[PDB]
Amino acid sequence: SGVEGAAFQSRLPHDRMTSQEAACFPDIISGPQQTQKVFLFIRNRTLQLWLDNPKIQLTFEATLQQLEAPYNSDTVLVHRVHSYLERHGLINFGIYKRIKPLPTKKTGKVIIIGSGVSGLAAARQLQSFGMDVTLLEARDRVGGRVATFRKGNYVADLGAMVVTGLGGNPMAVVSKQVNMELAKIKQKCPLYEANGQAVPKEKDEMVEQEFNRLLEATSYLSHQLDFNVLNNKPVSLGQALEVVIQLQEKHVKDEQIEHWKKIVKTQEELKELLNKMVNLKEKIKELHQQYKEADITAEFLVKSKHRDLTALCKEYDELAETQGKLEEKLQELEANPPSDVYLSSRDRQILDWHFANLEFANATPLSTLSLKHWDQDDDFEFTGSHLTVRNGYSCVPVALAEGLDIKLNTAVRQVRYTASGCEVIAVNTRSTSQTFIYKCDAVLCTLPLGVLKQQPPAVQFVPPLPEWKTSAVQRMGFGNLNKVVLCFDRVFWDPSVNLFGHVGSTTASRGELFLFWNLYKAPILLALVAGEAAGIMENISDDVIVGRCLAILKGIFGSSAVPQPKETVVSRWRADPWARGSYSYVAAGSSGNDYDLMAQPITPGPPIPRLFFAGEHTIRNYPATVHGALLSGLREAGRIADQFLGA
Numbered sequence: 001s002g003v004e005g006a007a008f009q010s011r012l013p014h015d016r017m018t019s020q021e022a023a024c025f026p027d028i029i030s031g032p033q034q035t036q037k038v039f040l041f042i043r044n045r046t047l048q049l050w051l052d053n054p055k056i057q058l059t060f061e062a063t064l065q066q067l068e069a070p071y072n073s074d075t076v077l078v079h080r081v082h083s084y085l086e087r088h089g090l091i092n093f094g095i096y097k098r099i100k101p102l103p104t105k106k107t108g109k110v111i112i113i114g115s116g117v118s119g120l121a122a123a124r125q126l127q128s129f130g131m132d133v134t135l136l137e138a139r140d141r142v143g144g145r146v147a148t149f150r151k152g153n154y155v156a157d158l159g160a161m162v163v164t165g166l167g168g169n170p171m172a173v174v175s176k177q178v179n180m181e182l183a184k185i186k187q188k189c190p191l192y193e194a195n196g197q198a199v200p201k202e203k204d205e206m207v208e209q210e211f212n213r214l215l216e217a218t219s220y221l222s223h224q225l226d227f228n229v230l231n232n233k234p235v236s237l238g239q240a241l242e243v244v245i246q247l248q249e250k251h252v253k254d255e256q257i258e259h260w261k262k263i264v265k266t267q268e269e270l271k272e273l274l275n276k277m278v279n280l281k282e283k284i285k286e287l288h289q290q291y292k293e294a295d296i297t298a299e300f301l302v303k304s305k306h307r308d309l310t311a312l313c314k315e316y317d318e319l320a321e322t323q324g325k326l327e328e329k330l331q332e333l334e335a336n337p338p339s340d341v342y343l344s345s346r347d348r349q350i351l352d353w354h355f356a357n358l359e360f361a362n363a364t365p366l367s368t369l370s371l372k373h374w375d376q377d378d379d380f381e382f383t384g385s386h387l388t389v390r391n392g393y394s395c396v397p398v399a400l401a402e403g404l405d406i407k408l409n410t411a412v413r414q415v416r417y418t419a420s421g422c423e424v425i426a427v428n429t430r431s432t433s434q435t436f437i438y439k440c441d442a443v444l445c446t447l448p449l450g451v452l453k454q455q456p457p458a459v460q461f462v463p464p465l466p467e468w469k470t471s472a473v474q475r476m477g478f479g480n481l482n483k484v485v486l487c488f489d490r491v492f493w494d495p496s497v498n499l500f501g502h503v504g505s506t507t508a509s510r511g512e513l514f515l516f517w518n519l520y521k522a523p524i525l526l527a528l529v530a531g532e533a534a535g536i537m538e539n540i541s542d543d544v545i546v547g548r549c550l551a552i553l554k555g556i557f558g559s560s561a562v563p564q565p566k567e568t569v570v571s572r573w574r575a576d577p578w579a580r581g582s583y584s585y586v587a588a589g590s591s592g593n594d595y596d597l598m599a600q601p602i603t604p605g606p607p608i609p610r611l612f613f614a615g616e617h618t619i620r621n622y623p624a625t626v627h628g629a630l631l632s633g634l635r636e637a638g639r640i641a642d643q644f645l646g647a
């Protein structure tokens with residue numbers, strides 16, 4: 001349906017109130033059921049009005065005007081609902097034409113550290129709410145881990161790059177607002193072995209299905225058998241994977257042993273049977289000789305010796321009957337061995353390609369992921385096909401930057417917060433002698449987890465953060481992932497495929513240049529560096545790693561088909577001091593609960609909160625994504641406005 005779709009698109013149950021709404025509307029949950037049903041229709045229709053046209057502000061007045069009778073009659077309730085939705089960023093979020101110009105007199109000073117999607121999203125909210133917002137950003141550009149390279153006619157994303165499904169995705173709104181050109185990804189992804197030979201279809205399918213089987217087995221191990229702690233240590237996904245492969249190898253070795261035992265036993269029966277047939281041939285040779293040597297007892301001696309000869313001959317024909325039914329069992333046993341090994345060497349390399357794919361998705365070696373919780377956010381996937389941004393994902397944060405007070409090249413070094421307000425201290429990255437002091441009522445920290453983990457610290461907190469926050473920082477994973485961008489003057493790959501895989505020769509390096517990505521109709525190739533390779537490869541110069549790319553591609557398509565690239569780019573997210581990695585992951589011994597701890601604001605001791613946190617690492621249900629960063633910015637804007645302007 002139409003207004004039900006709007007609730008789904010807002011990640012809300014269309015037919016019941018959330019706990020959050022129950023808190024804000026206690027008179028509804030405790031009141032008659034009929035009024036609760038009225039509430040839900042107001043909410044859904046208001047969201048639809050916004051979502052049908054997110055390019056302009058949806059005001060209370062326009063909501064009231066577009067509600068049909070009787071709903072346009074309960075003005076107070078309509079306003080309450082509109083107000084709630086607006087405060088939580090469910091309407092009037094992103095970038096839109098304001099009908100009511102911004103209030104000229106402000107209320108509260110908020111410093112936002114970082115101009116990534118989370119910082120920008122919060123800034124636009126807080127500015128809409130009438131506050132004085134200033135973003136301090138260390139880079140010379142906005143977007144943070146959204147980073148688009150442009151040179152000549154080439155455009156390519158170095159950070160985030162995919163919109164996952166649009167159904168339920170707040171980025172769907174931003175797409176309409178900003179005019180992102182989205183393009184569906186074709187799912188076919190051919191694999192090539194390290195010699196450049198294509199992986200045959202059967203091997204591709206066999207290994208992939210086994211990969212799915214192994215992984216489902218780890219999840220059974222974890223969530224049915226409660227095999228989550230071992231020798232006082234939390235189990236990692238990599239560990240469980242090694243265990244389930246070891247058991248398959250054991251099983252293969254068993255069926256091989258059973259089969260060899262059947263072989264040996266049949267050989268032993270043949271040896272025995274032949275020895276017995278031998279002695280019966282000798283016995284018949286003796287009777288056949290005493291049969292030609294032949295009175296009345298003699299005329300009866302021949303009858304008896306023929307009865308004896310042909311009875312031994314019946315014994316012998318029956319034993320050669322068993323001889324045949326046995327060496328017929330032997331022949332098909334030698335012709336039907338069970339698998340010699342679990343995984344051929346080539347099979348293993350291909351399986352390591354799928355593991356690399358998973359290390360790409362989580363940005364970290366599998367041996368670091370929590371077995372129990374690494375995919376705790378699975379249940380929140382959006383519906384619809386994934387897409388890429390043909391005009392470059394930076395268009396989103398660049399559009400969000402319009403009109404904001406943003407100080408670039410301004411690196412926060414220290415954050416002071418007391419019960420009387422806050423001070424943020426920063427240096428000019430082009431002249432680190434120049435120092436700045438920003439007084440404010442509240443600080444929103446969107447510093448990446450990688451920056452928070454940095455030892456010695458990049459940013460100093462005064463007073464230091466509480467143990468519950470720092471130890472959550474300590475526990476959480478922050479992974480890495482890098483790209484080689486290859487710009488050519490001609491397209492030599494299969495234009496109808498967006499993806500193809502290079503199977504690494506060894507397990508340790510399975511993530512090196514394992515995936516080649518294709519951007520729609522454009523002579524660009526992205527090669528991914530995942531897993532253990534991602535951090536190590538940062539120590540390789542651009543020219544050498546490009547050379548390794550070209551060697552792979554020449555192996556796949558032919559040495560003369562691959563020209564020299566016109567432009568190249570290489571991400572080094574770990575070494576980037578403003579990222580110190582790519583995005584969080586649930587490390588073994590962490591859990592979704594640590595993301596909630598990350599989101600919790602700090603209050604100086606006996607009082608009201610001063611220091612707030614947003615960023616992809618603060619949102620339990622959508623971590624490590626652009627939309628999660630966005631949603632987290634909206635969440636904190638709501639929390640801060642609730643604090644400083646009232647619920």
Ligand SMILES: [C]C1=C([C])[C]=C2C(=[C]1)N([C][C]([O])[C]([O])[C]([O])[C]OP([O])(=O)OP([O])(=O)O[C][C]1O[C](N3[C]=NC4=C3N=[C]N=C4[N])[C]([O])[C]1[O])C1=NC(=O)[N]C(=O)C1=N2[C]([C][C]=O)C1=C(O[C]C2=[C]C(F)=N[C]=[C]2)C(F)=[C]C(F)=[C]1
Binds near residue numbers: 117139160448
């Ligand atoms: C890095 C990365 C990469 C490479 C990739 C990716 C990613 C990443 N992602 C994630 C995102 O991006 C995130 O989440 C966000 O971004 C976050 O945001 P925030 O939170 O806000 O943060 P930032 O941005 O960083 O911001 C912050 C700020 O701050 C600043 N600073 C620092 N320090 C300082 C400062 N200031 C001052 N002071 C001081 N001291 C900085 O600078 C900044 O600004 C993502 N996501 C999404 O959604 N998408 C995508 O795409 C992504 N990605 C990826 C990975 C994985 O896999 C993904 C994917 O894939 C896809 C692809 C890509 C490529 F490239 N190629 C191919 C393919 C998927 F599929 C999915 C997902 F989800 C993800």
